[PDB]
């Protein structure tokens with residue numbers, strides 16, 4: 001039986017509920033962490049929040065013209081009229097995206113505000129066969145759609161270095177990390193895929209302190225109903241971890257499986 | 266109808282501007298912001314581990330809610346209005362629930378963080394420049410709007426030219442200066458018999474230098490009635506050398522006549 005074990009792991013903090021189900025085993029809803037919808041701090045990071053340091057636009061239309069200074073910070077605004085990344089978006093080396101902010105003359109519903117508007121797609125936390133908890137789509141999601149943000153505790157590299165559990169760490173290449181082990185959102189449950197269907201993009205919204213980009217996941221292709229979400233964790237993860245477990249993504253493209261490791265040797 | 270929404274879509278509802286009185290254009294000598302801003306290093310304590318928080322598994326309507334107890338009790342009724350018993354002369358500090366609390370985002374202790382719900386309008390008054398009025402009946406105890414602006418130290422406030430849009434945060438001490446950056450509250454006129462009252466509130470941080478200032482109706486308010494709060498004795502002590510109060514109430518405390526009588530007493 002597939003059991004509904006939490007109606008909403010976000011406790012009403014997201015735009016939509018994110019339920020949890022388990023049809024595999026008796027493991028209950030995960031509660032060894034604190035669900036947070038926005039990045040938190042546990043020591044002073046001194047993020048630059050001075051409103052006069054913001055780059056900002058002078059638009060009073062919907063920010064769809066090429067005169068929008070905010071879009072010009074990434075050559076162009078990369079969102080189409082429905083908030084999706086443009087077909088030609090560089091999915092290998094994404095540019096930094098500067099969304100409109102409180103210093104801009106535009107309205108809060110201009111076309112340069114996708115990530116700040118939050119989760120719209122319907123996601124579900126579920127028990128996988130071989131990779132613990134994972135996150136899947138409850139609906140068809142077109143290419144270039146914003147899925148969720150990678151949220152957690154902002155920490156220094158020095159702090160990352162003394163922590164035991166490094167399995168929920170995202171690198172913001174002083175250098176910083178988001179650690180989602182103790183505090184995080186739905187993204188902490190997203191597994192690694194060697195054939196990923198989401199891509200991380202660095203985004204700026206309410207501040208433009210370049211040390212602390214916010215990490216937004218967008219679909220890299222059309223995603224089918226029921227499909228598990230996954231991003232490429234990267235080489236730093238697997239260089240550390242492959243000595244202890246191998247990739248179970250099951251793809252013919254898999255480059256971190258025991259069979260992939262044996263073939264390289 | 267000279268502006269559909271002075272807030273540019275930043276609030277839950279629009280705040281239109283009208284002028285049926287004179288030729289004054291919609292005010293634009295300030296920047297509308299929905300949340301307080303900084304123009305110097307303030308380092309508001311955002312450390313999540315410094316939040317007092319509750320362990321409630323209900324809607325935080327019980328007297329056992331720690332957050333309510335920090336506030337003496339929770340003063341919100343089931344509809345988010347202050348209890349008739351609320352102290353309107355010397356209001357307590359309110360601690361709303363927050364991201365560290367175990368409760369849901371829809372708990373009964375989250376009125377101010379949920380934002381504006383009443384229909385307001387920026388309008389041209391007969392004798393007092395711009396003012397703010399209600400476009401609906403508003404029961405006693407309803408959250409109206411927050412006093413939002415630029416956070417400055419007493420030192421910075423001590424050297425600023427225009428002190429007409431300043432609110433003191435007496436806890437070091439600090440001020441909100443709404444002259445250059447501010448929300449709809451910057452346009453609210455002074456009343457010696459006010460229909461709204463300021464309350465110090467804590468939501469996403471509990472840095473005691475920076476309570477957020479939330480106005481609640483002190484009585485039932487009729488449609489079209491102008492909002493007003495009592496600016497207080499410091500304001501009038503400084504300004505009465507230039508002008509005196511024109512609220513016109515029999516309860517007026519800061520007219521030329523009231524001040525003459527004060528000197529007699």
Ligand SMILES: C[S@@+](CC[C@H](N)C(=O)[O-])C[C@H]1O[C@@H](n2cnc3c(N)ncnc32)[C@H](O)[C@@H]1O
Nearest residue numbers: 131132133167168188189190191192247248249
């Ligand atoms: C950030 S967590 C993801 C959520 C995790 N599955 C859980 O149940 O909490 C990362 C951990 O999930 C597991 N995992 C993620 N992707 C994997 C993959 N492709 N193969 C094997 N294990 C994986 C590993 O234990 C990894 O250290």
Ligand SMILES: C[S@@+](CC[C@H](N)C(=O)[O-])C[C@H]1O[C@@H](n2cnc3c(N)ncnc32)[C@H](O)[C@@H]1O
Nearest residue numbers: 393394395429430451452453454455510511512
């Ligand atoms: C914060 S502003 C209020 C909005 C202002 N009416 C405007 O048009 O921008 C405060 C100023 O409004 C005027 N004002 C507000 N209430 C008043 C009152 N009851 N009596 C006299 N002047 C008042 C004074 O010039 C005061 O310094």
Ligand SMILES: [Cl-]
Nearest residue numbers: 045046047048
């Ligand atoms: Cl710094």
Ligand SMILES: [Zn+2]
Nearest residue numbers: 057059063068
């Ligand atoms: Zn623009």
Ligand SMILES: [Zn+2]
Nearest residue numbers: 063100106110
């Ligand atoms: Zn814009």
Ligand SMILES: [Zn+2]
Nearest residue numbers: 057070100104
């Ligand atoms: Zn902009």
Ligand SMILES: [Zn+2]
Nearest residue numbers: 194247249254
């Ligand atoms: Zn793989």
Ligand SMILES: [Zn+2]
Nearest residue numbers: 319321325330
């Ligand atoms: Zn509670």
Ligand SMILES: [Zn+2]
Nearest residue numbers: 325362368372
């Ligand atoms: Zn609560």
Ligand SMILES: [Zn+2]
Nearest residue numbers: 319332362366
């Ligand atoms: Zn609480």
Ligand SMILES: [Zn+2]
Nearest residue numbers: 457510512517
């Ligand atoms: Zn008066």
